[PDB]
Design a protein around this nucleic acid. Structure first.
Ligand code: K
Ligand code: MG
Ligand code: MG
Ligand code: MG
Ligand code: MG
Ligand code: MG
Ligand code: MG
Ligand code: MG
Ligand code: MG
Ligand code: MG
Ligand code: NA
Ligand code: NA
Ligand code: NA
Ligand code: NA
Ligand code: NA
Lengths: 129, 395, 151, 64
RNA sequence: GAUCCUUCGAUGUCGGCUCUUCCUAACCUAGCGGCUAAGGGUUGGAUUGUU
RNA sequence: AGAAAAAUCCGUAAGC
RNA sequence: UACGUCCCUCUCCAAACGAGAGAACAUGCAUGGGCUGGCAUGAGCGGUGGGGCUCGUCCCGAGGCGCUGAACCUUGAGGCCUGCAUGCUCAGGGACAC
RNA sequence: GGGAUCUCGCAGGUAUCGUGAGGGAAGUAUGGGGUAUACGGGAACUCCCAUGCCGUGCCUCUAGUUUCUGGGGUUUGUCGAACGGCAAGUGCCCCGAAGCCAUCGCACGGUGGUUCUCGGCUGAAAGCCAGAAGCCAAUCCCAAGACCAGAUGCCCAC
RNA sequence: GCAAAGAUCUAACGGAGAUAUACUCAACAUGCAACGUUGGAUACUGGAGCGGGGAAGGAUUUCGUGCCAACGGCACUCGUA
């Protein structure tokens, strides 16, 4: 799928929502594809699908479990060509279980590591960086 | 949970030697031609390179990557003896050894604890007797014994420490080791060994540019260490009487003793390891013969392999060197052994051919932003010291 | 015995310069030369061996103190400096009786117990009565360009 | 590879050195900024002007 | 449950945390046509002192 | 008192 | 008796103490110079400054400008250069072997 | 030849390179590509590419750490002032080498025999094939109280 | 084990408390460690003080000259001994 990205967002983190669905927060509940290990919290990185919940936003999508994709992170990661890069904030986008993106626009830039895995997001991305 | 650590690397005790020693040699194939299987080098330091990857069906294929490397300095080696072994129902037993006619002061220094304040009598009777007529008879008898009742041939080689003009490596007595001869029949092995007696061999006659190798070396020492850093167990909660950095339960009531599988405190570091499959990226010649060592086809800058300000704690690299991908066990200045690989070498990665595009030679002190002294001068200009020196020279 | 060690075998092996003169003068260039291309052991050549030095000598030296005191305890920095200076001068003069002058004590202690300066210039005077030394302070504006001298 | 100039000091950044940064209010022309050492990033975040810092290329160009 | 053999000039009591080892009547992984196989694995949280 | 030794030279438990 | 080994002395790839790797007139140690890096423009002096004080001048004044990528630091639990310069060593001492 | 009122003393010492009995022992899991159609919606092996955990290291880069109190800045007191500093158990703030260190960075993690469940071939049970596991050996770590008559340098003794 | 209450350094006098050798030998590698007084340096207490006077309690601990066996949990040439 992709190379390695340093894990950034353990369970319990709150990240911004970059879509235009009315949500303002996302609360990380778990990470898809995590195999367990004793005492270790599951953590997410770019291009991951997470189970989330809205903590502040429109009341019609609030007290339930949803899916989201991470597109930005403050923790820096190293690319194969030896460049270290990081963003200014953590962000996410609400999607389908199959990857189709609820909403029709994205606010800031998105990372190539997450635009490669999800082709529907890269269509609405305003810049791939 | 799985257990902490590997029980196949016990006892975690200090090594018996400081040099790396090959416990086994690659299997002998009589179809090939006779050759040597080992070499001793000295660790200098680390840097990184840039390289374009040829790996079909990869997300990095046809793209550039940055890979760290380690530099090991390899002056030539001198052969001084031949040994043979015979197989017995209880193991290999050595038959005898055939010494060269002349040895060097640095080889004979290895037999003394205080060479300068001594009579320096080593190998004198041997030299006289070898010159005499019965000495030739004895040598011929030993060589015939090899040719008739041997299965393994090894040569005795040593390092030339006066060729390696290093100020931080303090030792003046040579390091001695046995290198096996592989390939061919026993007669052919003996012929090659006799041809290489009192002669110097180079690392490029043993290894080629894009092959792989194994490394035998001794790890960096750390002294007595506790269980948290020695074995990797978990710390205990802040609210703990008598300390947090311990193992809580060291056994059950029965058996009524401590088992060998439980973590205790003691020596960490200074162990021997063999480190399979280190791909070699470049074999460089001496800076006397070729002064443009770190120059490539893509980068035409004239530079050597030593960084600005020198390798930290080691100095300048003055002889031939080997560039290995990754890391090796041990600190700088330690002697190491390079061995021909034992594992199969049929992987695409192990068969790829390497072409370097860039080699970093910036300073390892602080953050380096200049590749060369000419570049540093170009950035700055004439400084106040330069102006006053020119003025003083004028007047 | 020493005369059999020095010269003799060593001076005979210094015939390699005649061998190197013939080889180099044969129109050879860029030849890898190691042995005597020379004599080696600059301690052997340079040392003139002027002689067993007098009983009364005077020297002027700089001591780099900040390399002897590094990450030492702040409460012990200055007593440690006194001990280090004593040992330095003792190893230089082969004496066991080294006396610190009032000027040197004041200079070492004049910024308190942790503010010991980073360099000091001293004057050493060896005397016989049994041998001992007296060490005093030489005030200087700067330490650049100053090497060990005899006075 | 390629050599890039530091965003603050215009130092040269060679392959394998430095850190890169993407701000939220990003420029379309320059979405990613390169810094050569943490000192430069500290000054940039403090919002200092490079022409008043005597060891930067812009200051040297203005004065010298 | 029954019993009352040892211990009443005393063998520190539930749960959790930490750490090692062993078993099989096999949850996963591995082979067969239900059988073989104990080699390597077997998670993180809300309420409750809990199991 | 027990050898995973041996039984002009060198080379053949041979012609040597 | 001899070969030699150990202690004292020096170095740090080793190190709780033992043990280890080394050297034993050796660029070995010391100081200085050059390099490589760190901080960010020294002391002192001098003709732009919101204002103010006295006879076009003469003074009080935070800050600024110039000399000035200056000044200082850089191996030390131990960065580089003598395949850069000087200074110190002047029969090493003791115990075993015996 | 000395000791004590018989006794040994009459022989090894030092320094290298090796052997290897015996003991320890380790790698494991998920996904994709291709096949990529066969069968009548939906396969499989060879082979390629990543990742999780575990293990053994390393310090080029990035991150953490500063009693190099390194350079600068700043508060109260204090030496008549400037300079130099000093006290506030490291006054406090910014940047900071070397060293240590992080699944917060980077590198590496091999081969053969034997048997069982079972499938066979001859053949009246027996003889012979293939054969997931597992087991044994090797690679890897310690290694002569495993008392090596293994090899070798120098001195002494006979 | 003798780790709260930050900390001492230097010279000259004093003292048996030393510069204490079989010799060779300039000296170091064969007499170590520790004490009092005076001068100088560096710190601490910091006026709710390791400042200057009293009650209760103690009863010669006060002062000078000596001494250093025991006691002052290390030491003393010094002591409320
Ligand atoms: K075994
Ligand atoms: Mg009952
Ligand atoms: Mg060390
Ligand atoms: Mg004790
Ligand atoms: Mg104590
Ligand atoms: Mg206590
Ligand atoms: Mg005070
Ligand atoms: Mg108060
Ligand atoms: Mg007492
Ligand atoms: Mg009195
Ligand atoms: Na837990
Ligand atoms: Na407690
Ligand atoms: Na004070
Ligand atoms: Na201070
Ligand atoms: Na105290």
């Amino acid at each position: 799928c992709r190379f390695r990205v340093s894990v950034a967002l353990p369970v319990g983190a709150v990240v911004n929502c970059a879509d235009n669905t009315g949500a303002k927060n996302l609360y990380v509940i778990s990470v898809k594809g995590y195999h367990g290990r004793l005492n270790r919290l599951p953590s997410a990185a770019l291009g991951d699908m997470v189970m989330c919940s809205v903590k502040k936003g429109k009341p019609e999508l609030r007290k339930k479990v949803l899916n989201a994709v991470i597109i930005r992170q403050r923790k820096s990661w190293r690319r194969k060509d030896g460049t270290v890069i990081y963003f200014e904030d953590n962000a996410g986008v609400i999607v389908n279980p199959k990857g189709e993106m609820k909403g029709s626009g994205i606010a800031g830039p998105v990372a190539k590591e997450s635009a490669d895995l999800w082709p529907k997001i890269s269509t609405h991305a305003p810049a791939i960086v | 949970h799985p257990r902490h650590g590997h029980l196949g690397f016990l006892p975690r005790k200090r090594s018996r030697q400081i040099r790396g020693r090959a416990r086994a040699f690659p299997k002998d194939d009589a179809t090939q031609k006779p050759h040597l299987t080992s070499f001793m080098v000295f660790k200098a330091g680390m840097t990184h390179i840039v390289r374009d990857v040829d790996r079909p069906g990869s997300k990095v294929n046809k793209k550039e990557v940055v890979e760290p490397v380690t530099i090991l300095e390899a002056p030539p080696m001198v052969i001084v003896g031949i040994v043979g072994y015979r197989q017995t129902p209880v193991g290999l037993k050595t038959i005898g050894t055939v010494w060269a006619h002349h040895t060097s002061v640095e080889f004979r220094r290895r037999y003394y604890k205080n060479w300068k304040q001594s009579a320096q009598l080593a190998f004198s009777r041997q030299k006289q007797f070898a010159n005499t007529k019965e000495g030739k008879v004895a040598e011929a008898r030993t060589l015939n014994a090899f040719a008739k009742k041997a299965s393994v041939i090894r040569v005795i080689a040593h390092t030339q420490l006066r060729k390696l003009r290093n100020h931080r490596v303090g030792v003046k007595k040579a390091h001695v080791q046995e290198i096996q001869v592989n390939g061919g029949s026993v007669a052919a092995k003996i012929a090659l060994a006799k041809s290489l007696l009192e002669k110097e061999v180079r690392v490029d006659s043993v290894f080629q540019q894009s092959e792989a190798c194994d490394v035998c070396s001794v790890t960096k020492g750390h002294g007595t260490e506790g269980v948290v850093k020695r074995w990797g167990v978990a710390c205990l909660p802040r609210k703990t009487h008598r300390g947090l950095r311990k193992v809580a339960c060291i056994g059950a009531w029965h058996p009524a003793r401590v088992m060998y599988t439980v973590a205790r405190a003691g020596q960490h570091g200074y162990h021997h390891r063999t480190q399979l499959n280190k791909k070699i990226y470049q074999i460089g010649r001496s800076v006397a013969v070729e002064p443009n060592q770190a120059t490539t086809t893509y980068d035409l800058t004239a530079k050597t392999i030593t960084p600005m300000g020198g390798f930290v704690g080691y100095g300048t690299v003055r002889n031939d060197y080997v560039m290995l991908k990754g890391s090796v066990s041990g600190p700088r200045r330690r002697v190491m052994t390079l061995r021909r690989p034992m594992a199969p070498q049929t992987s695409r990665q192990l068969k790829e051919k390497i072409v370097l595009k860039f080699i970093d030679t910036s300073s390892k002190i602080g953050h380096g932003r200049f590749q060369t002294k000419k570049e540093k001068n170009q950035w700055f200009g004439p400084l106040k010291k330069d102006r006053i020196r020119r003025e003083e020279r004028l007047r | 015995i020493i005369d059999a060690r020095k010269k003799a075998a060593e001076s005979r092996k210094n015939r390699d310069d005649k061998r190197w003169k013939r080889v180099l003068a044969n129109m050879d260039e860029e030849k890898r030369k190691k042995f005597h291309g020379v004599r080696g052991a600059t301690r052997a050549s340079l040392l003139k061996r002027t002689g067993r030095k007098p009983d009364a000598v005077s020297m002027e030296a700089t001591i780099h103190l900040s390399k002897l005191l590094k990450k030492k305890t702040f409460s012990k920095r200055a007593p440690l400096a006194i001990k280090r200076i004593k040992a330095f001068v003792g190893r230089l003069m082969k004496t066991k009786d080294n006396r610190i002058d009032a000027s040197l004590n004041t200079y070492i202690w004049h910024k308190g117990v942790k503010g010991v300066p980073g360099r000091v210039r001293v004057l050493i005077q060896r005397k016989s009565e049994h041998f001992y030394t007296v060490i005093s302070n030489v005030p200087v504006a700067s330490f650049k360009g100053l090497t060990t001298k005899t006075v | 590879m390629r050599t890039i100039e530091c965003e603050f000091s215009h130092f040269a950044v060679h392959p394998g050195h430095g850190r890169r940064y993407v701000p939220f209010a990003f420029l379309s022309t320059k979405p990613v900024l390169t810094f050569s050492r943490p000192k430069c990033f500290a000054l940039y975040m403090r919002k200092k002007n490079p022409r008043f810092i005597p060891w930067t290329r812009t200051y040297r160009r203005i004065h010298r």
